[PDB]
């Protein structure tokens, strides 16, 4: 059909320009029309990409012809890396103009994820970084480096280059983003605090947006701290390199690379802990790690942080600040959802319960408070009675029936948790002293139920909860 | 009404607990496999490793230096007072940088003709003294 015409067209591209027969120029224009048509309907293969890129960046057909070759470049298949290497070399030759360089850089930014291999592209970081001197290619090269930047590429002299560029040009967003990335990769060399997210890199749709959608349809078929890496004070004062990294040993695993479950599975034994432990509260991959750690410093840090937060954010303890309101409720809901996992509770919650119980009224955060009461560690009844159960009974005997039902549900859940945790110890104070505690708890709740039935004039709505407890 | 609410919450908790159990089983299996693999698997060896590392580094540096010399010889011959080649200037700059760390500046002489100095200053290899352009130094790439 027309594929032989395409092969003849690329062969003629391989021959070279023409001097006298300028109507053959219109013939090759018809050839470009065929190339555009086949690139719009189904695209181009991977065998002619290298040839067409080398011809466009060689500079033999003039700017007026090379301007549309890059526009009609539609990668229907995957792009090879050697073609991009040859294109970078042809750019480094210097025969190209400015418009074609801008077009090539925009195309490389748009078609970045369509390349199979990206290690030899990163192996050419210096040739891309050196082109920042030109003011015409600054934003596109900055956008490309924002994607090609890794940890082994950030170096002090490049930091000084970026600093002098900023001093010469001023506050440029395409420079501010790169500086923020360099600071994130090396916080001990650069200090930047960006104000606000605003649009740093221009979201200008490229000339291949109708081609981007084409290749997509073809391929169809704060209270809590923020997550940050460890503090840079680690190995701050060092005289020489340690013996570990000289022999290239294991080391550790970075925190920004942990984004999926298999990555946690492969590196569960070695992980990087955050700078603030509170950020672990809202991350499942770190909850899976802290589920089985039992470390003393981590527990101490988490205890101190959570205790201070609960003490400062409470509504009726140590301050009269109702402005928090739903924030404290959401924080308690997050804590309850986290402590449902790990099948245990924190000590900070127990301390907060022991502190703020005598001052509670019974209506502010009834649900979250009574759910936090259920996660109390197993202890002797005689020791835990005067701290919790006396105040609970004093608030129980003078409240409404719904409070009675709620505390009955909470006591049922507490008994279930205690029994579940005690059932596993027998497989490993003896059991004789342990059964006495649950017996006393059952007798206490039975006395509570009898007195409540006498008080509420034999209401069946409470007898239902009593029988629900005795069922368990 | 209360029983209906209880049943709904029970079903939701059942689904969540099932998912958590699956994930925990996966984690435990992976950890057991890793422990088994780890359990399945003397300064002389350390000194041998350091020696072969030094040998590899020396071989790489020698090859790179030979290639750089060949490139500078075949691409930048002696230009036609006499002027020295660019290789001699680069060697002088490197020696001044490595021997005197706190004063690596070299005064520009007649042998350093403006073409090569401008090339080195444009390619970021050399830097002028901030106070007098008559003294140039080499960029500290290792730092």
């Amino acid at each position: 059909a027309e594929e032989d015409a395409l092969q003849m067209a690329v062969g003629y591209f391989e021959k070279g320009p023409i001097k006298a027969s300028q109507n053959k120029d219109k013939t090759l224009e018809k050839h470009l029309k065929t190339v555009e048509n086949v690139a719009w309907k189904n695209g181009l293969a991977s065998e002619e990409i290298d040839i067409l890129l080398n011809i466009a960046l060689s500079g033999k057909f003039g700017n007026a012809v090379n301007t549309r070759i890059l526009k009609c470049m539609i990668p229907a298949t995957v792009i090879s890396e050697d073609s991009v290497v040859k294109a970078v070399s042809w750019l480094c030759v210097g025969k190209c103009s400015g418009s074609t360089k801008v077009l090539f850089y925009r195309w490389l930014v748009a078609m970045f994820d369509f390349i199979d291999r990206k290690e030899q592209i990163n192996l050419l970081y210096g040739f891309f970084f050196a082109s920042l001197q030109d003011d015409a290619l600054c934003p596109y090269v900055c956008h490309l480096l924002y994607l090609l930047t890794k940890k082994e590429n950030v170096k002090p002299f490049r930091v000084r280059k970026l600093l002098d560029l900023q001093a010469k040009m001023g506050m440029q967003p395409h420079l501010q983003a790169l500086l923020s990335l360099y600071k994130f990769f090396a916080p001990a060399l650069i200090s930047v605090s960006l104000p606000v997210k605003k649009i740093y890199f221009k979201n200008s749709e490229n000339l291949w947006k109708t081609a981007l959608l084409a290749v997509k349809q073809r391929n169809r078929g704060s209270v809590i701290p923020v997550l940050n890496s460890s503090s840079y004070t680690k190995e701050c004062g060092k005289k020489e390199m340690s013996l570990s990294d000289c022999l290239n040993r294991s080391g550790s695993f970075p925190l920004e690379q942990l984004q999926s479950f298999p990555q946690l599975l492969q590196n569960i034994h070695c992980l990087e802990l955050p700078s603030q432990m509170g950020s672990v509260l809202n991350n499942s991959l770190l909850l899976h790690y802290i589920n089985c750690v039992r470390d003393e410093p981590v527990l101490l840090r988490f205890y101190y942080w959570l205790s201070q937060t609960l003490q400062e954010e409470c509504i009726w303890y140590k301050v009269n600040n109702y402005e928090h309101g739903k924030e404290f409720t959401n924080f308690l809901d997050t804590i309850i959802r986290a402590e449902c996992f790990l099948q245990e509770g924190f000590y900070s919650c127990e301390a907060f319960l022991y502190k703020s119980l005598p001052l509670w009224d019974g209506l502010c955060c009834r649900s979250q408070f009574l759910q936090l009461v259920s996660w109390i560690p197993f202890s002797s009844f005689s020791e835990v009675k005067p701290l919790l159960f006396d105040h609970l009974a004093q608030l129980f005997f003078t409240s409404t029936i719904y409070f009675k039902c709620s505390v009955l549900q909470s006591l049922k859940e507490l008994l279930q948790n205690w029994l579940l945790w005690l059932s596993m110890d027998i497989h490993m104070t003896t059991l004789g002293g342990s059964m006495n505690s649950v017996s006393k708890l059952i007798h206490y709740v039975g006395w509570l139920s009898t007195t409540a039935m006498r008080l509420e004039s034999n209401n069946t709505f409470l007898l239902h909860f009593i029988l629900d407890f005795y069922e368990k | 009404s209360t029983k209906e609410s209880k049943n709904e919450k029970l079903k939701e908790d059942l689904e969540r607990e099932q998912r958590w159990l699956d994930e925990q089983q996966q984690i435990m299996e992976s950890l057991n496999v890793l422990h088994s693999e780890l359990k399945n698997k003397s300064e002389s060896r350390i000194f041998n490793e350091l020696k072969t590392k030094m040998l590899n580094i020396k071989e790489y540096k020698e090859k790179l230096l030979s290639t750089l010399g060949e490139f500078l010889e075949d691409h930048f011959p002696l230009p036609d007072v006499n002027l020295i080649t660019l290789h001699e200037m680069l060697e002088i700059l490197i020696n001044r940088l490595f021997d005197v760390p706190h004063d690596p500046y070299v005064k520009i002489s007649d042998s350093f003709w403006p073409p090569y100095v401008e090339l080195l200053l444009r390619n970021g290899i050399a830097l002028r003294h901030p106070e007098d352009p008559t003294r140039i130094r080499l960029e500290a790439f290792h730092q």
Partner: peptide, 12 residues
């Protein structure tokens, strides 16, 4: 849940 339902029954 049951506690939230008891709360919303208490509010009315």
């Amino acid at each position: 849940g049951v506690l939230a339902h008891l709360e919303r029954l208490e509010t009315q």
